[PDB]
Design a protein around this motif. Structure first.
Motif, PDB file in Angstrom:
ATOM      1  N   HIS A  30       0.818  -1.224   0.000  1.00 36.18           N
ATOM      2  CA  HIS A  30       0.000   0.000   0.000  1.00 36.18           C
ATOM      3  C   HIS A  30       0.860   1.287   0.000  1.00 36.18           C
ATOM      4  CE1 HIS A  30       0.539   1.527   4.122  1.00 36.18           C
ATOM      5  NE2 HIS A  30       0.552   0.276   4.542  1.00 36.18           N
ATOM      6  N   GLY A  31       0.231   2.436  -0.256  1.00 32.76           N
ATOM      7  CA  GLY A  31       0.867   3.744  -0.196  1.00 32.76           C
ATOM      8  C   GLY A  31       0.143   4.640   0.768  1.00 32.76           C
ATOM      9  N   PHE A  32       0.192   5.946   0.482  1.00 36.87           N
ATOM     10  CA  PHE A  32      -0.364   6.989   1.344  1.00 36.87           C
ATOM     11  C   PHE A  32      -1.791   7.416   0.902  1.00 36.87           C
ATOM     12  CE2 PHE A  32      -1.151  11.424   2.295  1.00 36.87           C
ATOM     13  CZ  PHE A  32      -0.878  11.495   3.648  1.00 36.87           C
ATOM     14  N   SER A  38      -6.761  -1.542   1.993  1.00 39.88           N
ATOM     15  CA  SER A  38      -6.940  -0.969   0.677  1.00 39.88           C
ATOM     16  C   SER A  38      -6.888  -2.033  -0.416  1.00 39.88           C
ATOM     17  CB  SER A  38      -5.884   0.107   0.364  1.00 39.88           C
ATOM     18  OG  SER A  38      -5.763   1.034   1.422  1.00 39.88           O
ATOM     19  N   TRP A  39      -6.283  -3.197  -0.143  1.00 37.18           N
ATOM     20  CA  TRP A  39      -6.212  -4.265  -1.116  1.00 37.18           C
ATOM     21  C   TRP A  39      -7.242  -5.353  -1.061  1.00 37.18           C
ATOM     22  CZ3 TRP A  39      -3.106  -2.903  -4.917  1.00 37.18           C
ATOM     23  CH2 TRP A  39      -1.925  -2.171  -4.642  1.00 37.18           C
ATOM     24  N   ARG A  40      -8.209  -5.197  -0.179  1.00 38.40           N
ATOM     25  CA  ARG A  40      -9.151  -6.282   0.074  1.00 38.40           C
ATOM     26  C   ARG A  40      -9.803  -6.885  -1.146  1.00 38.40           C
ATOM     27  NH1 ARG A  40     -10.732  -1.546   0.678  1.00 38.40           N
ATOM     28  NH2 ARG A  40     -12.824  -0.843   0.220  1.00 38.40           N
ATOM     29  N   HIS A  41     -10.170  -6.074  -2.147  1.00 29.14           N
ATOM     30  CA  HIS A  41     -10.881  -6.613  -3.313  1.00 29.14           C
ATOM     31  C   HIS A  41      -9.952  -7.562  -4.100  1.00 29.14           C
ATOM     32  CE1 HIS A  41     -14.274  -3.974  -2.786  1.00 29.14           C
ATOM     33  NE2 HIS A  41     -13.498  -2.907  -2.857  1.00 29.14           N
ATOM     34  N   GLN A  42      -8.676  -7.161  -4.194  1.00 33.70           N
ATOM     35  CA  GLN A  42      -7.709  -7.900  -4.973  1.00 33.70           C
ATOM     36  C   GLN A  42      -7.280  -9.198  -4.235  1.00 33.70           C
ATOM     37  OE1 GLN A  42      -7.166  -4.312  -4.710  1.00 33.70           O
ATOM     38  NE2 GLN A  42      -8.439  -4.238  -6.550  1.00 33.70           N
ATOM     39  N   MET A  43      -7.157  -9.070  -2.931  1.00 32.64           N
ATOM     40  CA  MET A  43      -6.858 -10.211  -2.084  1.00 32.64           C
ATOM     41  C   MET A  43      -7.907 -11.315  -2.328  1.00 32.64           C
ATOM     42  SD  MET A  43      -5.631  -8.477   1.504  1.00 32.64           S
ATOM     43  CE  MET A  43      -4.963 -10.019   2.101  1.00 32.64           C
ATOM     44  N   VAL A  44      -9.177 -10.942  -2.322  1.00 29.44           N
ATOM     45  CA  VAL A  44     -10.278 -11.923  -2.551  1.00 29.44           C
ATOM     46  C   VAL A  44     -10.206 -12.442  -3.949  1.00 29.44           C
ATOM     47  CG1 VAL A  44     -12.771 -12.213  -2.645  1.00 29.44           C
ATOM     48  CG2 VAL A  44     -11.751 -10.949  -0.762  1.00 29.44           C
ATOM     49  N   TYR A  45     -10.019 -11.559  -4.922  1.00 29.80           N
ATOM     50  CA  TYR A  45     -10.083 -11.988  -6.327  1.00 29.80           C
ATOM     51  C   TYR A  45      -8.965 -12.960  -6.634  1.00 29.80           C
ATOM     52  CZ  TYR A  45     -10.835 -11.391 -11.441  1.00 29.80           C
ATOM     53  OH  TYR A  45     -11.089 -11.585 -12.798  1.00 29.80           O
ATOM     54  N   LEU A  46      -7.759 -12.658  -6.141  1.00 31.89           N
ATOM     55  CA  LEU A  46      -6.635 -13.526  -6.397  1.00 31.89           C
ATOM     56  C   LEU A  46      -6.655 -14.791  -5.542  1.00 31.89           C
ATOM     57  CD1 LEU A  46      -4.817 -12.747  -8.741  1.00 31.89           C
ATOM     58  CD2 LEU A  46      -5.441 -10.700  -7.567  1.00 31.89           C
ATOM     59  N   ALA A  47      -7.055 -14.690  -4.281  1.00 39.00           N
ATOM     60  CA  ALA A  47      -7.160 -15.895  -3.457  1.00 39.00           C
ATOM     61  C   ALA A  47      -8.175 -16.859  -4.086  1.00 39.00           C
ATOM     62  CB  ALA A  47      -7.569 -15.603  -2.011  1.00 39.00           C
ATOM     63  N   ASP A 216     -14.696   4.771   7.352  1.00 39.27           N
ATOM     64  CA  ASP A 216     -14.623   4.673   8.789  1.00 39.27           C
ATOM     65  C   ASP A 216     -13.485   3.761   9.208  1.00 39.27           C
ATOM     66  OD1 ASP A 216     -16.619   6.414   9.457  1.00 39.27           O
ATOM     67  OD2 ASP A 216     -18.139   4.853   9.722  1.00 39.27           O
ATOM     68  N   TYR A 217     -13.220   2.721   8.445  1.00 34.96           N
ATOM     69  CA  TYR A 217     -12.121   1.782   8.793  1.00 34.96           C
ATOM     70  C   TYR A 217     -10.790   2.570   8.777  1.00 34.96           C
ATOM     71  CZ  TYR A 217      -8.853  -2.027   9.354  1.00 34.96           C
ATOM     72  OH  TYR A 217      -7.829  -2.824   9.821  1.00 34.96           O
ATOM     73  N   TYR A 218     -10.574   3.336   7.728  1.00 38.55           N
ATOM     74  CA  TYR A 218      -9.395   4.202   7.668  1.00 38.55           C
ATOM     75  C   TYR A 218      -9.356   5.244   8.771  1.00 38.55           C
ATOM     76  CZ  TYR A 218      -8.792   2.277   2.879  1.00 38.55           C
ATOM     77  OH  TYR A 218      -8.673   1.517   1.758  1.00 38.55           O
ATOM     78  N   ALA A 219     -10.497   5.900   8.978  1.00 42.23           N
ATOM     79  CA  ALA A 219     -10.568   6.966   9.907  1.00 42.23           C
ATOM     80  C   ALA A 219     -10.254   6.472  11.319  1.00 42.23           C
ATOM     81  CB  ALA A 219     -11.961   7.625   9.857  1.00 42.23           C
ATOM     82  N   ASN A 220     -10.829   5.352  11.714  1.00 42.01           N
ATOM     83  CA  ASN A 220     -10.598   4.828  13.039  1.00 42.01           C
ATOM     84  C   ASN A 220      -9.141   4.462  13.235  1.00 42.01           C
ATOM     85  OD1 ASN A 220     -13.281   4.960  13.850  1.00 42.01           O
ATOM     86  ND2 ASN A 220     -13.780   3.014  12.975  1.00 42.01           N
TER      87      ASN A 220
END
Length: 320
Positions: A30-32, A38-47, A216-220
């Motif tokens: 990830h970056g800034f 931030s990678w969750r969609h890709q993690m699922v797609y590739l897994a 909210d996940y980021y914010a928290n």
């Protein structure tokens, strides 16, 4: 399975790693101002397609601990690549090379991973930040300040405390919402005392890719850690420029796919489009495939165009 989380001791840190799937490893960086999440969609797609996705929180971010927030010199590009090398030795001991996917500061880390230890990377998908040739005359902060002025975010990020104080009364949720939904091709400006007022809003309909739960996940997380660790990477740009002098003229020798949003602000740095499309980038990165520009997209493509990014990664890595 759901995404698993673990702590891994690496290069003096206690690094949080999210992991999903089994099979050959793909490291997501990830970056800034992003997180593993931030990678969750890709993690699922590739897994789902027989790979093991791993995504750490980098030094200074998220659930990763141990780097001294009061010393930005410990957020150099050498320290960060150090983290990743150590990580790979710890979590992928049976794989001489892994696939790497990265974005923004991640992509900067990944380019250096590939110059320093090409022996560790099978193929690279980099998002948003093109390879930056070292300018012998000046560092990246000075160079961007000469183009865009003192209110340019990279410049305003430099002195510890300053941008943190600007963001403190605004709160993390509004800062991140403004950055994540940003679509104008100019860089961010943070004039002193003007909070987020210098940054324009795009039509609300263009940001529906970001749910309130995601924000909210980021914010928290950034309310808990503050922004210092993340901002510290930009504070190490001057030293990074000194430290990377040995790699003048060096080429990246790893097979690479580069993807950028049409409206990505980095893609609008003067001279970037020329470098990317007219030969300079290919000279520096000779195994670079054709560059993909995502029409209609801006700065956070893995979240804004999850399907296209997911399938671009899968199709590229299937070539190997």
């Amino acid at each position: 399975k759901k995404i698993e989380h673990k702590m891994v001791a690496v290069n003096g840190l206690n690094m949080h790693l999210a992991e999903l799937g089994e099979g050959p490893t793909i490291l997501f960086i990830h970056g800034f101002p992003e997180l593993w999440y931030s990678w969750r969609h890709q993690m699922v797609y590739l897994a789902e397609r027989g790979y093991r996705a791993v995504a750490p929180d980098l030094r200074g971010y998220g659930d990763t601990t141990g780097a001294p927030l009061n010393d930005p010199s410990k957020f150099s590009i050498l320290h960060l690549v150090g983290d990743v090398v150590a990580l790979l030795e710890a979590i992928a001991p049976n794989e001489e090379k892994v696939f790497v996917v990265a974005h923004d500061w991640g992509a900067l880390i990944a380019w250096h991973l590939c110059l320093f230890r090409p022996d560790k990377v099978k193929a690279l998908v980099n998002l948003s930040v093109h390879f930056s040739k070292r300018n012998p005359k000046m560092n990246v902060v000075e160079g961007l300040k000469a183009i865009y002025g003192e209110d340019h975010y990279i410049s305003r990020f430099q002195v510890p405390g300053e941008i943190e104080a600007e963001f403190a009364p605004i709160g993390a949720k509004s800062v991140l919402k403004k950055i994540l939904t940003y679509r104008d091709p100019a860089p961010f400006y943070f004039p002193k005392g003007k909070g987020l007022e210098a940054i324009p809003d795009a039509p609300v309909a263009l940001s529906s890719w970001l749910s309130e739960e995601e924000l909210d996940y980021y914010a928290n997380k950034f309310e808990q850690t503050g922004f210092t660790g993340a901002v510290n990477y930009y504070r190490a740009l001057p030293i990074n420029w000194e430290l990377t002098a040995p790699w003048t003229g060096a080429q990246v020798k790893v097979p690479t796919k580069f993807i950028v949003g049409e409206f990505d602000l980095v893609y609008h740095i003067p001279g970037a489009k020329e470098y990317i499309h007219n030969g300079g980038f290919k000279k520096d990165v000779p195994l670079l495939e054709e560059v993909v520009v995502l029409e209609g997209a801006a700065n956070f493509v893995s979240q804004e165009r999850p399907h296209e990014i997911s399938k671009h990664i899968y199709d590229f890595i299937q070539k190997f």
